[PDB]
Design an enzyme around this catalytic site. Structure first.
Site, PDB file in Angstrom:
ATOM      1  N   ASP A 139      -7.376  -2.850  -0.656  1.00 14.35           N
ATOM      2  CA  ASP A 139      -7.448  -3.711  -1.834  1.00 14.35           C
ATOM      3  C   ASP A 139      -8.761  -3.527  -2.592  1.00 14.35           C
ATOM      4  O   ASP A 139      -9.791  -4.095  -2.216  1.00 14.35           O
ATOM      5  CB  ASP A 139      -7.311  -5.181  -1.388  1.00 14.35           C
ATOM      6  CG  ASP A 139      -7.340  -6.161  -2.549  1.00 14.35           C
ATOM      7  OD1 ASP A 139      -7.189  -5.721  -3.703  1.00 14.35           O
ATOM      8  OD2 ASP A 139      -7.470  -7.388  -2.298  1.00 14.35           O
TER       9      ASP A 139
ATOM     10  N   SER B  60     -10.363   0.217 -21.004  1.00 11.15           N
ATOM     11  CA  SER B  60      -9.393   1.156 -21.533  1.00 11.15           C
ATOM     12  C   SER B  60      -9.542   1.253 -23.041  1.00 11.15           C
ATOM     13  O   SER B  60      -9.924   0.292 -23.705  1.00 11.15           O
ATOM     14  CB  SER B  60      -7.974   0.702 -21.163  1.00 11.15           C
ATOM     15  OG  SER B  60      -6.971   1.467 -21.801  1.00 11.15           O
TER      16      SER B  60
END
EC number: 3.4.23.22
Length: 330
Positions: A35, A199
């Protein structure tokens, strides 16, 4: 040193991935959920409340000659999906894919929430976010990666998740045969303890690319792709009959649909998520309404590039003095 381990979907939907981890002496092998959105290595154990164990493999520290109680240390964690666990702490030898750390904090669960009990395939979590998020008190502990880092050939790990198939986690090296073209690297902020990056935009299907900054985290422990409501609405508007259902808890779509791809930007580069990766199947057995793999982050407080996005790429988690993230097509 290096390590290399295969990671395997827990079910036919890629709801999560499990990776075998050797703990203790002699080795006890547990299948852990790696994770990159948390920083605790915790396991089902001989100390876990018996009624809360249902099929998981447990760590028994009393059977490990290298286990030592970390006296006075406790831990307690709550995840974004509302699940939780807590307990006490041992140090022991932990190996992943041939890479060994001695003195690793292994957090032994005394209590786990129902979601964990009900998932027989996940024996615990191995956190790979920054150690500043580790929950051990009163002495915070380091992640497996942080402990291994100085010994690694290069201070990196990579995630290469499969679509409906196994993939690979590598530590200490970049497998240049595992991706196509070049890796594009992008800046990381560690201010919130995550692999947080920005992004450069998105496209829906064959549509034009929209240049827009989207701050989010690379999180292998989250199943879906969670993005701003504007972006998600633009995606689902291209699927006839798709709608947000408050009763189901997100966007659903007719199982008869063909889903468009979704592209996200990494600098000037582009990662394409095929439409099939966005199908999470019937909402209940026999239903013709299917759950979507792209959902709104509104009310999470952060955008999350979870497995839906990451499995479309070869992803480099660069833990150099100034960390960065790399993405390549594959």
């Amino acid at each position: 040193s290096t390590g290399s381990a295969t990671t395997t979907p827990i079910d036919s939907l890629d709801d999560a991935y499990i990776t075998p981890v050797q703990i203790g002496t002699p080795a006890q092998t547990l299948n852990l959920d790696f994770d990159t959105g948390s920083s605790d290595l915790w396991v089902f154990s001989s100390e876990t409340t018996a009624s809360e164990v249902d099929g998981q493999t447990i760590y028994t520290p009393s059977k490990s000659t290298t286990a030592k109680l970390l006296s006075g240390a406790t831990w307690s964690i709550s995840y974004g999906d509302g699940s939780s666990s807590s307990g006490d702490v041992y140090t022991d030898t932990v190996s992943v894919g041939g890479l060994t750390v001695t003195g690793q904090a292994v957090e032994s669960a005394k209590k786990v929430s129902s979601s964990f009990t009900e998932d027989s395939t996940i024996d615990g979590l191995l956190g790979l976010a920054f150690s500043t998020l580790n929950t051990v008190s009163p002495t915070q502990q380091k992640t497996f990666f942080d402990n291994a880092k100085a010994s690694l050939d290069s201070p990196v790990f990579t995630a290469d998740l499969g679509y409906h198939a196994p993939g690979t986690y590598n530590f200490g090296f970049i497998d240049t045969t595992a991706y196509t073209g070049s890796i594009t690297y992008t800046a990381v902020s560690t201010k919130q303890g995550f692999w947080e990056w920005t992004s450069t935009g998105y496209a829906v299907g064959s549509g034009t690319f929209k240049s827009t900054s989207i701050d989010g985290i690379a999180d292998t422990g989250t199943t879906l792709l969670y993005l701003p409501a504007t972006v998600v609405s633009a995606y689902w508007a291209q699927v006839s009959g798709a709608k947000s259902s408050s009763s189901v808890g997100g966007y659903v779509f007719p199982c008869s649909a063909t889903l468009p791809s979704f592209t996200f930007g990494v600098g000037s580069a582009r990662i394409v998520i095929p439409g099939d990766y966005i199908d999470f199947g019937p909402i209940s057995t026999g239903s013709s309404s299917c759950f979507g793999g792209i959902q709104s982050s509104a009310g999470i407080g952060i955008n999350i590039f979870g497995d839906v996005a990451l499995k479309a790429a070869f992803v480099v988690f660069n833990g150099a003095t100034t960390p960065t993230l790399g993405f390549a097509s594959k």
